[PDB]
């Protein structure tokens, strides 16, 4: 019914302690309503929790946007003999994204409560948190919050007046972006290299230690107990259909006030920047292109970002995709091809190299983009690079190849004249 | 382009160009080339036998 | 060079079936030995068997 | 671009299988707790934490530490070698006391990070990947560090410094040289990533327990 | 209230804080499950 | 019984549950291209040379690792599968060294033959190739690691068949290398089989080096007498 989105009340936000202004410990979390009627949620059963999640319309916050209730019902198969586990993906690998870091260091108890609720819903014996290795202070804050939770009896032995046992473990990686991928996350937990495995078999069937497993993002886990407490329909109210809820948005790049804010889902991009980011540097006329979902998603120019929303379906209609809601803006006073080449270099440096397409083709893409930056190439090679991107995308084991092919595709599609002009200038200068 | 008597050439440094790939012997329509090879004292891939029967060669 | 004295040192024939070869050899008067065709037996492959919970089939790396 | 670090190990007088390395007993208690974290029959899953602990105890990872971890967890040494050479947070070569990592990814590159890089270049007089003679600092260029909003930023020995300006990095460097540890966190007094003068979110005090619980719960 | 930042606890974290907390929490866990054997290589 | 019905290019075939696409195609008489898949090794899924199109499915699947589902129609000679094969072969040949005349596996190379049969006839790679340093694993197996295509067949064979965990991969991305990370001789009674299982000339027989070419040899089938196994 609602047509205009972008007005979310202060009391209506999920992460009321986003900025670390209030106590992030058990006392402050209790003061803010955490661990309230949790025993009732545990006793109500897993089926009710799964129904609440499904009717809530919550989608995967990781980036893919898969209905979370569907995965948590996939995991709800009866017992087999193996223990069942819950894995929280706290890797936070993508460039321009910091949302997981803020909601862990400044509010760990929502994450812990969501871990417990998800474990009860999916029958998980314990929860493993694969926090990024660089986030050491954040991991220490999470661990001391878990220590407080064990002292308070909120997790551990029966976790409540319930009869259900649940443990929360925190493990740390060592500087590997590919480990953010769920199968690579499982591999890194198991003590091997962070190389993603093939699907099928899916994590629900064969996951960590060969046991049934569910991998969920930090935001997805953290929002779930509030969904249970306040109702699925309340979260369904926000946003359009099939795009329900609220999202955390990180605005970075050439803005006056780079910040991360929690706001309604289907906010206009221009509205979001003008309201929360303080506007783009030099006025809205100075904007050249913006990357909406982080490094993986393709960039869009001023014309289509003028009146584009923030959700999965509409951003797909803009041929980008919502991604991880990581906003990176670029004005007209910067070398855009240099930025895209730097992104391709990052993807080259972060690939594990398990399968030939990603490894070979992404190295080739990095070399080609480095040559494009200087203009040493020829106009006929743009279509060649496009075909290379097509060959890479859809043929790799995991989605890192797709996330490396998409920026090149978007840059070509939206700025081919700039590349041609640079090649012409280089040819004129070198004769 | 005239085809005359055969010869084996070598690089300006003075080492022979032949690497015992046996492509010439495989392609020879008259089976006039016979080749044997082994690693050299320095480990190079070089021939120990390279015969051309010029009474079988069709030039 | 390598010399020979038997003219049949390079003679190889192709047949669709074993029966055709046997018939040709019999009608040409050659004593023969026949070897039965070796076929690779079917195998049970499972990618999920690599990541075993309790089985030894679990791989150390991949 | 190109890495520059070799992934083959050659025996060295100060780096060889006979190089002395061992675990202090409290580190052994930490190891046994870490092993106790995982399910029985899957001890190896502890390769990363034990190796990280060895690096923290020693400062870097010699081949002897790798073999010690392998024999402690009863795994083939080649598996520990693969784990150590795959992840980039493991130092297979001696590193300085203060390991400075500077993020130069596109979000950080947009907010003038190369200027801070060259400021560190001038302050220390060492190249991008070299080490200062007195074994005090090591400069390394890294990818995204999870602090894109606070660009530009640096990471020195598990502490995050954010919203840096060149001057700020000279104060950080000379305070580190003095002996004390500068406080982690963003500069300019912006207090962990809110709008500098906006404050458009989370102003009204948060609501109490059970503000909007639905009926039947 | 808001003006004060309440996350300065990380300003005094040692290099061994995480592992020490892990050791402390080791006594709060359930007994781990067992696959039947000591190692897949056994 | 428990067999399910699947189609290969529109021809019905009955297969056991758990059978992969590659074996279903084998039952019809077609051999899917492969570099990392071996029957007697565990499934890896690295080379992506077995990518085949399933009818009414937008994404290609790895025939070596994907179990087949009932009613599937495998389109092996479809345009999408051919394009995928050409792309994978292009990526495989992008960094391969021009060593064919000096390579001991000239006329018996799976890389060469599959490039002739399924890849393109020309290159568009205008960059400079990579080169890695050779290793030493004894006097039996010659190592020229530049030719390696990272199929990890040798690692799987050593780990599972030979029972030796010496071989593995070190590094990440483009400069990931197969080796031992230390000067160590991979010694076992079955060590020579990694020469056969390696599709490229990265691993070759050292006593056999440079002596002959495959098209010249005559094949005589005999019995080993060095032990009682026969
Ligand atoms: N938060 C961060 O820093 C980063 C986020 N990303 C985002 O991750 C996205 C792609 O990630 P993927 O996991 O590969 O997406 P995906 O579509 O392959 O799967 C996403 C989730 O849905 C599950 N799933 C999908 N299909 C299923 C099925 N048929 N049955 C059972 N479960 C199924 C998967 O198990 C998985 O948990 C990218 O679009 C990217 O934006 C990428 C890098 C970093
Ligand atoms: C290369 C790559 C890196 C990723 N890194 C992360 C990460 O750091 N954090 C995360 O939550 N998801 C990451 N993902 C997405 C995960 O697949 C996702 O978290 C998982 O599928 C569960 O997502 P969900 O909680 O939204 O359902 C990454 C995906 C890819 C392909
Ligand atoms: S696409 Fe790249 S990162 Fe993903 S499995 Fe293949 S090589 Fe590894
Ligand atoms: S064997 Fe023949 S084709 Fe090969 S290098 Fe020698 S002369 Fe040339
Ligand atoms: S391995 Fe095959 S393709 Fe590579 S150089 Fe040798 S013969 Fe040529
Ligand atoms: S050496 Fe040969 S068998 Fe081993 S990974 Fe390389 S190509 Fe495969
Ligand atoms: S771009 Fe610098 S922390 Fe991510
Ligand atoms: S044969 Fe299937 S991916 Fe290699
Ligand atoms: Mg070989």
| Diameter over CA atoms, chain A | 81
Which of F115, F120, F132, F173 to mutate: most A Cβ within 10 Å? F173
> F45 and A348 in contact by Cβ < 8 A?
no
Percentage helix, strand, coil, to 5, in chain A? 45, 15, 40
- The full DSSP string for B13-56 is TS-B------HHHHH-TT--EEEEEEE-TTS-EEEEEEEE-TTT
What is the distance between the alpha carbons of residues A155 and A157, in angstroms, rounded to a whole number? Answer: 7
Nearest CB neighbour to D149, from listed A191, A229, A250: A250
Between strands A85-90 and A126-131, the pairing is: parallel
D105 and D173: one domain? yes
Binding site as annotated, residues of F for Mg(2+):
105, 195, 198, 200, 203
| Assigned architecture for domain A246-331 | Roll (3.10)
Bridge partners for F204 per DSSP = F142
D113 and D146: one domain? yes
Strands of A213-217's sheet in order across: A167-172, A126-131, A85-90, A213-217
What is the distance between the alpha carbons of residues A173 and D45, in angstroms, rounded to a whole number? Answer: 12
Q: Where in chain A is the domain with CATH 3.40.50.11540?
A: 26-237
State yes or no: cis peptide before A35, omega within 30 of 0.
Answer: no
Specified resolution (Å): 2.7
User: Can you give the CATH number for the domain in which D178 is found?
Assistant: 3.40.30.10
The alpha carbon of residue A431 is apart from the nearest alpha carbon of chain E, in Å, by 58
Say if ligand 1 is within 6 A of residue A136 CB.
no
D178 and D109: one domain? yes
Q: Which residue has the tokens 């056994």?
A: E42
For A332, how many CA atoms within 13 A lie in the half-sphere containing its CB? Answer: 10
CATH 1.20.1440.230 fits A336-430, yes or no: yes
D117 and D58: one domain? no
> C58 and A192 in contact by Cβ < 8 A?
no
CATH 1.10.940.10 fits A26-237, yes or no: no
What is the distance between the alpha carbons of residues F129 and F94, in angstroms, rounded to a whole number? Answer: 7
Residue F61 DSSP code = E
The H or E element containing residue A348 is helix A336-350
- What are residue A110's phi and psi, to 5 degrees? -65, -40
Q: Which residue has the tokens 């006979």?
A: D18
A373: exposed, middle or buried (Cβ count in 10 Å: 0-12, 13-18, 19+):
middle
Bridge partners for A89 per DSSP = A130, A217
Per DSSP (E only), the strands in F102-218 are: 141-143, 168-170, 177-179, 203-205
| Ligand 4 centroid from CA B25, angstroms | 8
Residue burial D83-115, b: 16+ Cβ < 10 Å; e: rest: bbbbbbbbbbeebbebbbbbbbbbbbbbbebee
Contacts of F184 (CB under 8 A, 6+ apart): F137, F166
Q: Where in chain A is the domain with CATH 3.10.20.600?
A: 246-331
The four Cα atoms A348, A353, A358, A360 give a dihedral, to 10 degrees, of 80
What is the distance between the alpha carbons of residues F169 and F180, in angstroms, rounded to a whole number? Answer: 8
What token pair was written down for D180?
């004390």
- What are residue F173's phi and psi, to 5 degrees? 65, -135
Ligand 7 pocket test: pick from D106, D108, D140 the residue with the most ligand atoms within 8 Å of its Cβ.
Answer: D108
What token pair was written down for F47?
């080379």
A282 torsion bin: left (phi>0), alpha (psi -120 to 50), beta (else)? left
> F152 and C62 in contact by Cβ < 8 A?
yes
- What are residue B35's phi and psi, to 5 degrees? -130, 135
What token pair was written down for B43?
């480990």
Please report the residues numbered 1 through 42 in chain E whose beta carbons come closer than 8 angstroms to any beta carbon of chain A.
1-7, 9-10, 13, 17-18, 21-22, 24-25, 28-30, 33, 35
What is the distance between the alpha carbons of residues A75 and F79, in angstroms, rounded to a whole number? Answer: 37
Nearest partner of D143 among D94, D97, D89, judged by Cα: D89
The residues placing their C-beta within 5 Å of ligand 9, an ion, are F 198
What is the distance between the alpha carbons of residues F205 and A297, in angstroms, rounded to a whole number? Answer: 48
Ligand 6 pocket test: pick from F134, F136, F178, F194 the residue with the most ligand atoms within 8 Å of its Cβ.
Answer: F178
What is the distance between the alpha carbons of residues E40 and D79, in angstroms, rounded to a whole number? Answer: 14
Range of the domain at D65: 25-86
Q: Are D166 and D116 in contact (CB under 8 A)?
A: yes
Say if ligand 2 is within 6 A of residue A93 CB.
yes
Nearest partner of F98 among F63, F141, F144, F64, judged by Cα: F144
What token pair was written down for A374?
């200087």
Q: Where in chain A is the domain with CATH 1.20.1440.230?
A: 336-430
User: Can you give the CATH number for the domain in which D58 is found?
Assistant: 1.10.10.1590
Residue C12 vs residues C15, C31, C35, D123, D170: alpha-carbon distances, Å: 10, 16, 16, 80, 83
């Amino acid at each position: 019914k609602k047509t205009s989105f972008g007005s979310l009340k202060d009391e209506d936000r999920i992460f009321t302690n986003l900025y670390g202004r209030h106590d992030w410990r058990l006392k402050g979390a209790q003061s803010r309503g955490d661990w309230y009627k949790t025993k009732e949620i545990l006793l109500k059963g897993p089926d009710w929790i799964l129904g609440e999640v499904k009717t809530s319309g919550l989608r995967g916050r990781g980036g893919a946007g898969f209905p979370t209730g569907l995965k948590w019902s996939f995991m709800n198969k009866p017992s087999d003999g193996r223990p069942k586990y819950l894995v929280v993906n706290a890797d936070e690998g993508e460039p321009g994204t910091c949302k997981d870091r803020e909601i862990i260091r400044h509010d760990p108890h929502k994450l812990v409560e969501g871990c417990l609720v998800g474990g009860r819903a999916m029958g998980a014996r314990a929860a493993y948190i694969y926090i990024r290795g660089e986030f050491y202070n954040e991991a220490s804050n999470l661990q001391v919050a878990i220590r407080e939770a064990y002292e308070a009896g909120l997790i551990g032995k029966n976790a409540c007046g319930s009869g259900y046992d649940f443990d929360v473990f925190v493990v740390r990686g060592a500087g590997a972006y590919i480990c953010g991928e769920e199968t690579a996350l499982i591999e890194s937990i198991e003590g091997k290299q962070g190389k993603p495995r093939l699907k099928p078999p899916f994590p629900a069937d064969v996951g960590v230690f060969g046991c049934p497993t569910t991998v969920a993002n930090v935001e997805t886990v953290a929002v779930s107990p509030t969904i249970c407490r306040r109702g699925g329909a309340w979260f369904a109210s926000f946003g359009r259909e099939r795009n329900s809820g609220t999202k955390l948005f990180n605005i970075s790049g050439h803005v006056n006030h780079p910040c991360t804010v929690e706001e309604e889902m289907s906010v206009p991009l221009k509205e979001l920047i003008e309201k929360h980011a303080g506007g783009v540097i030099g006025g809205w006329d100075n904007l050249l292109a913006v990357i909406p979902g982080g490094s993986s998603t393709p960039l869009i120019p001023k014309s289509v970002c003028e009146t584009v929303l923030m959700d999965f379906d509409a951003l797909v209609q803009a041929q980008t995709g919502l991604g991880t809601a990581a906003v990176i803006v670029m004005d007209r006073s910067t070398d855009i091809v240099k930025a895209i080449a730097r992104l391709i270099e990052f993807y080259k440096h972060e690939s594990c190299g398990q399968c030939t397409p990603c490894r070979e083709g992404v190295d080739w893409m990095n070399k080609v983009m480095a040559r494009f930056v200087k203009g040493d190439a020829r106009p006929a090679e743009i279509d060649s690079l496009w075909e290379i991107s097509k060959q890479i995308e859809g043929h790799t084991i995991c989605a890192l190849g797709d996330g490396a092919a998409w920026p090149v595709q978007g840059l070509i599609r939206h700025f081919r004249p700039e590349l041609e002009e640079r090649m012409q200038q280089f040819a004129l200068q070198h004769q | 382009r005239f085809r005359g008597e055969h010869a084996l050439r070598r690089y300006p440094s003075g080492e022979e160009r032949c690497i015992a790939c046996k492509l010439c012997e495989a392609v020879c329509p008259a089976q006039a080339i016979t080749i044997e090879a082994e690693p050299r004292a320095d480990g190079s891939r070089r021939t120990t036998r390279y015969d051309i029967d010029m009474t079988k060669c069709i030039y | 060079w390598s010399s020979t004295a038997d003219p049949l040192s390079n003679l190889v024939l192709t047949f669709s079936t074993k029966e055709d070869a046997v018939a040709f050899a019999e009608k040409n008067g050659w004593s023969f030995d026949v070897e039965e065709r070796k076929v690779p037996k079917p195998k049970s492959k499972s990618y999920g068997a690599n990541f075993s919970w309790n089985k030894r089939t679990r791989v150390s790396t991949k | 671009g190109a890495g520059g670090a070799l992934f083959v190990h050659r025996d060295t007088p100060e780096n060889n299988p006979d190089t002395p390395f061992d675990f202090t007993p409290e580190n052994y208690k930490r190891i046994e707790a870490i092993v106790k974290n995982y399910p029985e029959g899957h001890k190896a899953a502890a390769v990363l934490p034990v190796l990280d602990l060895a690096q923290r105890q020693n400062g870097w990872l010699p081949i002897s530490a790798m073999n010690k971890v392998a024999e402690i967890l009863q795994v083939p040494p080649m598996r520990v070698y693969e784990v150590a050479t795959f992840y980039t947070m493991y130092n297979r070569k001696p590193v300085g006391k203060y390991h400075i990592q500077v993020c130069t990814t596109t979000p950080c590159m947009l907010r003038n990070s190369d200027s801070i890089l060259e400021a560190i270049q001038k302050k220390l007089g060492i190249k991008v990947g070299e080490t200062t003679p007195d074994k005090l600092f090591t400069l390394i260029e890294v990818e995204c560090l999870g602090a894109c909003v606070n660009a530009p930023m640096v990471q020195i020995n598990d502490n995050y410094y954010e919203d840096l300006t060149p001057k700020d990095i000279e104060e950080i460097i000379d305070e580190l040289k003095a002996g004390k540890i500068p406080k982690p966190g963003p500069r300019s007094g912006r207090f962990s990533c809110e709008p500098a003068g906006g404050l458009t979110s989370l102003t009204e005090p948060p609501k109490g327990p059970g503000f909007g619980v639905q009926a039947g719960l | 209230d808001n003006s004060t930042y309440r996350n300065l606890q990380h300003h005094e974290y040692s290099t061994y804080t995480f592992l020490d907390l892990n050791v402390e929490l080791s006594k709060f866990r359930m007994p781990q499950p067992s696959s039947g054997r000591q190692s897949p290589r056994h | 019984s428990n067999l399910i019905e699947v189609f290969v290019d529109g021809q019905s075939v009955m297969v056991e549950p758990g059978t992969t696409v590659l074996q279903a195609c084998e039952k019809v008489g077609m051999q899917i291209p492969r570099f990392c898949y071996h029957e007697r090794l565990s499934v890896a899924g690295n080379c992506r040379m077995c990518l085949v199109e399933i009818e009414k499915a937008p994404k290609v699947v790895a025939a070596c690792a994907m179990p087949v589902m009932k009613g599937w129609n495998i389109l092996t000679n479809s345009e999408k599968s051919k394009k995928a094969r050409e792309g994978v072969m292009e990526f495989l040949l992008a960094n391969h060294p021009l060593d064919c005349p000096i390579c001991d596996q000239g006329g018996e190379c799976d890389l060469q033959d599959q490039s002739m049969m399924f890849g393109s006839d020309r290159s568009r790679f205008l960059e400079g190739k990579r080169a890695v340093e050779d290793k030493n694993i004894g006097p039996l197996v010659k190592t020229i690691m530049t030719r390696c295509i990272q199929c990890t067949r040798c690692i799987r064979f050593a780990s599972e068949i030979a029972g030796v965990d010496d071989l593995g991969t070190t590094g990440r991305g483009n400069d990931m290398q197969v080796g031992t990370y230390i000067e160590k001789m991979f010694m076992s009674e079955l060590s020579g089989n990694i020469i056969d299982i390696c599709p490229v000339g990265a691993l070759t027989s050292k006593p056999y080096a440079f002596t002959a070419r495959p098209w010249e040899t005559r094949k005589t089938e005999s019995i080993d007498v060095m032990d009682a196994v026969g």
